[PDB]
Amino acid sequence: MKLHELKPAEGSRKERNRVGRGVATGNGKTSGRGHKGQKARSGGGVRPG
Amino acid sequence: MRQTFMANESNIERKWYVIDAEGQTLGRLSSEVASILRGKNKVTYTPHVDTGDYVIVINASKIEFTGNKETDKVYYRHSNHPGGIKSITAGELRRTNPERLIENSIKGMLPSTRLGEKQGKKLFVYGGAEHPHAAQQPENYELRG
Amino acid sequence: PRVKGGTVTRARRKKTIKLAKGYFGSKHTLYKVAKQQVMKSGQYAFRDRRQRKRDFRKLWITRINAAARQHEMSYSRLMNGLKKAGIDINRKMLSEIAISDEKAFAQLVTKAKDAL
Amino acid sequence: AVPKRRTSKTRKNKRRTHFKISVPGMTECPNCGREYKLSHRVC
Amino acid sequence: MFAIIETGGKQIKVEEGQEIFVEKLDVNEGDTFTFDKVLFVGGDSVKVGAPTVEGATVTATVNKQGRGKKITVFTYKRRKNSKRKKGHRQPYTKLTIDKINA
Amino acid sequence: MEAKAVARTIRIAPRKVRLVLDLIRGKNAAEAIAILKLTNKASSPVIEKVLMSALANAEHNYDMNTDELVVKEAYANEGPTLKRFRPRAQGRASAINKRTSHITIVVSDGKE
RNA sequence: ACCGAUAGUGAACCAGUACCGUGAGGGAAAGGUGAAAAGCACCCCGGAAGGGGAGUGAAAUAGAACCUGAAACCGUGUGCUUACAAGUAGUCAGAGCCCGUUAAUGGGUGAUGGCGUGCCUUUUGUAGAAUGAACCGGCGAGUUACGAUUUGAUGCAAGGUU
RNA sequence: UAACUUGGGAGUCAGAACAUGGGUGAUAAGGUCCGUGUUCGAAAGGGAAACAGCCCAGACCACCAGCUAAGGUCCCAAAAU
RNA sequence: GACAAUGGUAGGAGAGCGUUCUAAGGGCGUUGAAGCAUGAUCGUAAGGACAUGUGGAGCGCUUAGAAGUGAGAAUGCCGGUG
Ligand SMILES: [Mg+2]
Ligand SMILES: [Mg+2]
Ligand SMILES: [Mg+2]
Ligand SMILES: [Mg+2]
Ligand SMILES: [Mg+2]
Ligand SMILES: [Mg+2]
Ligand SMILES: [Mg+2]
Ligand SMILES: [Mg+2]
Ligand SMILES: [Mg+2]
Ligand SMILES: [Mg+2]
Ligand SMILES: [Mg+2]
Ligand SMILES: [Mg+2]
Ligand SMILES: [Mg+2]
Ligand SMILES: [Mg+2]
Ligand SMILES: [Mg+2]
Ligand SMILES: [Mg+2]
Ligand SMILES: [Mg+2]
Ligand SMILES: [Mn+2]
Ligand SMILES: [Mn+2]
Ligand SMILES: [Mn+2]
Ligand SMILES: [Mn+2]
Ligand SMILES: [Mn+2]
Ligand SMILES: [Mn+2]
Ligand SMILES: [Mn+2]
Ligand SMILES: [Mn+2]
Ligand SMILES: [Mn+2]
Ligand SMILES: [Mn+2]
Ligand SMILES: [Mn+2]
Ligand SMILES: [Mn+2]
Ligand SMILES: [Mn+2]
Ligand SMILES: [Mn+2]
Ligand SMILES: [Mn+2]
Ligand SMILES: [Mn+2]
Ligand SMILES: [Mn+2]
Ligand SMILES: [Mn+2]
Ligand SMILES: [Mn+2]
Ligand SMILES: [Mn+2]
Ligand SMILES: [Mn+2]
Ligand SMILES: [Mn+2]
Ligand SMILES: [Mn+2]
Ligand SMILES: [Mn+2]
Ligand SMILES: [Mn+2]
Ligand SMILES: [Mn+2]
Ligand SMILES: [Mn+2]
Ligand SMILES: [Mn+2]
Ligand SMILES: [Mn+2]
Ligand SMILES: [Mn+2]
Ligand SMILES: [Mn+2]
Ligand SMILES: [Mn+2]
Ligand SMILES: [Mn+2]
Ligand SMILES: [Mn+2]
Ligand SMILES: [Mn+2]
Ligand SMILES: [Mn+2]
Ligand SMILES: [Mn+2]
Ligand SMILES: [Mn+2]
Ligand SMILES: [Mn+2]
Ligand SMILES: [Mn+2]
Ligand SMILES: [Mn+2]
Ligand SMILES: [Mn+2]
Ligand SMILES: [Mn+2]
Ligand SMILES: [Mn+2]
Ligand SMILES: [Mn+2]
Ligand SMILES: [Mn+2]
Ligand SMILES: [Mn+2]
Ligand SMILES: [Mn+2]
Ligand SMILES: [Mn+2]
Ligand SMILES: [Mn+2]
Ligand SMILES: [Mn+2]
Ligand SMILES: [Mn+2]
Ligand SMILES: [Mn+2]
Ligand SMILES: [Mn+2]
Ligand SMILES: [Mn+2]
Ligand SMILES: [Mn+2]
Ligand SMILES: [Mn+2]
Ligand SMILES: [Mn+2]
Ligand SMILES: [Mn+2]
Ligand SMILES: [Mn+2]
Ligand SMILES: [Mn+2]
Ligand SMILES: [Mn+2]
Ligand SMILES: [Mn+2]
Ligand SMILES: [Mn+2]
Ligand SMILES: [Mn+2]
Ligand SMILES: [Mn+2]
Ligand SMILES: [Mn+2]
Ligand SMILES: [Mn+2]
C-alpha cells in the first residue's frame, strides 16, 4: 500500500452502531419501553423471582 | 396537469331562460333548475367558475305538492334568541310569498360555497305569470325529465 | 476532539424554512412550525396527486354526460353503446372532441346508438 | 384571567389601526410668521 | 384536422405541428418516431376507428428526451414514529408532430 | 442630493416616536416643522431638533434651497434598551424596559 | 489524532471578586478597533447627546458599546392581493395581473373549486378538553476501562502465545 | 412452499371492538371472565354524514389512461328522472 | 432481457449522508479563505455543487484512522427578544 491509499482487509471492521441518534436509525427510544429500560437496567445478574 | 379544457370569463356565455312552474312538483322543478344554474349542462362546464345560465321562474303560485305537504311539511327557522324557533309556516308559504318557497327550495340544492352562493343569485322567481326581465330577452325552456 | 455544532443545524433549518415560502404568518419563519407545516404539506401533496387523478376523470365524465344529454341520450347508454361498438377512446378525449368538434362527436354518437 | 394564546403579529397590528394621533388643527399667525392651534392665542 | 393516438399509458390529441410530451420512447433525439395506434381523426373528413383506424400513422420528430421536475415524496404517520422521503423525476420525450395521417 | 440626519439612542421608546413621525412623514418640510412644534408629545421637540439639523446639512453641504425641500422619509428604529426593574409584592421584582429610539430623517430636492 | 470564550479551571478580563447569608457557607457575569492611534484638525444643526460634510485608513457600510454580525423581534418602501365571509392555514385544480432564471415542459401573487381536526408523549384508543413547548440561538443523554461470550478478519497450526 | 436444529440479538407479559359458543350479571352494560374467527393496535385507500375495532381492499414511485369491489346512480354529488 | 417482491409500532438486520480532529497524497486562497446572505442548481434520502453580495485569512478534495459526530419537545440550563 502507498499509505495515502490504505485499505483495511475486506470483511474486517464494520462501523459501530450508535443508538439514540435520531429516528430513521431505527433506534430513538434506544431500546425497550417503560420497564427496566430504566438506566439502572437491573436484570439482577442471573435470576427470576 | 396537461391537455384538458378549462373555461375562462373571456370564454363563456350565460343565456336567460323562463320556466312555467304551473303544473310542476316542487322537488322536480327545483332540482332541474339547480342543474341549469350550476352550468352542468354545457359541456364547457368547469367547476371553479360559474358556467351557469340564468333562470326565471313563472306562475310560482301554481307549484304542486303531494301527501300532506301544505300542512304536514313544516318549514322551521330559528332566530338565535332563546326559544326563538319559528315553525310559523307550512307548505302554505305557497299561499304567502311562494317566490321564497321556491327560491329556498332550489337554493337548498346548490352547494354551500360562495360560488354556489353566487349561482343562487342567478335565480328569479315570481308568483305571477308576467315578469320584469323581458329586457334580457329570455328564451322559454321546457322542463325535461 | 470536541465537535462544535456550528453550521450544519442552521443550514438544515434554513432549507426547511425555505420550503415554507408560501406560508402565512409564523409558519414561514419559525423552524418548528414550518417543519410541521411542511410535513403535513407533503402528505397532502401525495394523497392529492392520487386524488387529482379521480377529480379529473369525474370532470370528463360529467362533460360527456352533458354532451350526450344534448343528443337526447343517457351517458350510461352512450358509453355502453361505444363499448359494444368497439370504440375505445378515453373520456378526456371525448370531452375534448365535444368541445373542439361538435360534428365529429355527434358522428361518434350516432355510431354509438347503433349496436343497440 | 390570562391570554390563552399569544396575540398574533397580524392580529396585534389590526388592533392598532385606531392608535394614530390627530394632525393638529393649525392656523397660521398673521405677519408674526409662526403657527398655532385654532382659536388659541397668537403668542 | 386533429387526431387521436394511443401512446403512453394513454391517449393524446394532436393538431399536427404541435409540441407534445409523452413517457419515454427509447428513441434517439432528433430521429422521427411514427405512432401506429391512431384512434380517430377530426376535421372536414372524419375517419373514426374501431380500436385503431386501419393504416394511418401520425409522424413526429423527436425533440428532447429529458426528465421532469423533481417532486419530493414525503409521507408520515402521526405520533407513531415514522416518515419517508424519496425524490422523484419522471423521464419524458418531447416531440413535435408533422403530417398526421402520413 | 437629498440630505439626511440622525439622532442615535434617544431616550424615548420607539412606539411613541413613531406616533409622531407618522404625522411628519412625507409632508413638505415647512409644514412639518409646524406640525412638529404643535403636537404635544416628547418626541415632538426631539424630532424637531433632528429635522432642523437635517435641513442644516441640506442647505450647507448640498447647496439646495431650503423652501422647496420635502421630508422624503423619517423613521425610528429599535436601539438598545436600558434594563431595570421594580420591586413588587411578596419579594418578587419584575422587569422594566426603558428602550431607545434611533431617529433618522431625510429631506429632498428632485431626482437630481 | 485535549478546550478554543455557554468550551477549557469557579476564575483567558484586578475571582473566591461583584453579589447573597448572622455565620459556616454559596458565588457570577464580563476576551477580540487597527498593520500602526494614524482615535475623525476643520465647518455645520444642537445645551449637550448625536449627526451631515471635510479628513486618517486597504477597509470606519473597521468610529470605540468598535472583526465577522445568523435567527427571533422592530421598522420604512411597496409588485400582486383583500371589506357577503365560518379559515390546524396547507395541498390539488386555476383565471387575472406583474416579472424574467444556475433556461426549465420558468418566477411572484392568487378570484374561484375539490380535499384536509398541528407535533411530541403516553396509550386498548388522543383533533383531544391527557402531557410537554412563548418564540429564536447556543448548550443538553449507551461512554470508557477491565473481564466474559459470540461473529467477522488476519498470522501460525498439533500447536498458538507471551 | 415451507419446516425443523443449533448459535448472536431482541421487544412483548395494560389490550380494544365486531361476529360467535359459553360462565358471572338481570338472556343489564361501550360489563366481566374463557373458546373460535376477523379487524384495530402497528393499515393509509373507498363505503357507513361524521365515526381505531363494521363492509370493500393491503399504499415501491410517477400519469389529466382503462376495468372493477363495498356502496351507489333527482340536486348538493360521479353515475338510471 | 423477461419474472416476482417492496404499508408498518416495539424491535432485528443492512447500506449510506454530514460534523470535528489526524496520516499520507494531491490541491485552492489578498487577482480574495472560512463564515454569512440571496438564487429558478444537482442526487432515491441524509445531503453536494455553482454564481453573485458580504467578509478580510484561512480552507477543501482523495484514501484510511479516531470521535466531546447530528436536537424540537426533558414544567431541561444560560442569553436574547416577544
Ligand atoms: Mg392541447
Ligand atoms: Mg319565548
Ligand atoms: Mg309576495
Ligand atoms: Mg405562490
Ligand atoms: Mg422534510
Ligand atoms: Mg427622558
Ligand atoms: Mg422570594
Ligand atoms: Mg440564613
Ligand atoms: Mg475470538
Ligand atoms: Mg406480570
Ligand atoms: Mg389477541
Ligand atoms: Mg356475557
Ligand atoms: Mg385479561
Ligand atoms: Mg336511485
Ligand atoms: Mg322511471
Ligand atoms: Mg463540507
Ligand atoms: Mg471553492
Ligand atoms: Mn451502521
Ligand atoms: Mn423501528
Ligand atoms: Mn407496560
Ligand atoms: Mn418513554
Ligand atoms: Mn421492557
Ligand atoms: Mn437501557
Ligand atoms: Mn441512575
Ligand atoms: Mn316558551
Ligand atoms: Mn359538497
Ligand atoms: Mn358552512
Ligand atoms: Mn477545535
Ligand atoms: Mn446543537
Ligand atoms: Mn335523456
Ligand atoms: Mn399600524
Ligand atoms: Mn419585603
Ligand atoms: Mn465567539
Ligand atoms: Mn453582606
Ligand atoms: Mn488589536
Ligand atoms: Mn452652536
Ligand atoms: Mn461631536
Ligand atoms: Mn483614503
Ligand atoms: Mn452589539
Ligand atoms: Mn481580524
Ligand atoms: Mn461589527
Ligand atoms: Mn437580519
Ligand atoms: Mn411588508
Ligand atoms: Mn368582496
Ligand atoms: Mn345573503
Ligand atoms: Mn362546520
Ligand atoms: Mn397548481
Ligand atoms: Mn404563474
Ligand atoms: Mn372542507
Ligand atoms: Mn422524538
Ligand atoms: Mn381547545
Ligand atoms: Mn402524566
Ligand atoms: Mn425547550
Ligand atoms: Mn404549556
Ligand atoms: Mn422562560
Ligand atoms: Mn473501542
Ligand atoms: Mn476464525
Ligand atoms: Mn436466538
Ligand atoms: Mn402471565
Ligand atoms: Mn394481562
Ligand atoms: Mn357471549
Ligand atoms: Mn325482564
Ligand atoms: Mn356483553
Ligand atoms: Mn370491555
Ligand atoms: Mn376493562
Ligand atoms: Mn376473543
Ligand atoms: Mn401500543
Ligand atoms: Mn383503515
Ligand atoms: Mn395484519
Ligand atoms: Mn375510512
Ligand atoms: Mn353512523
Ligand atoms: Mn368519508
Ligand atoms: Mn387510523
Ligand atoms: Mn365501468
Ligand atoms: Mn354491485
Ligand atoms: Mn350527477
Ligand atoms: Mn417496508
Ligand atoms: Mn404493498
Ligand atoms: Mn441494528
Ligand atoms: Mn473548521
Ligand atoms: Mn444554498
Ligand atoms: Mn478547494
Ligand atoms: Mn453531543
Ligand atoms: Mn430551544
Ligand atoms: Mn431565559
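Helices of chain D lie at 9-15.
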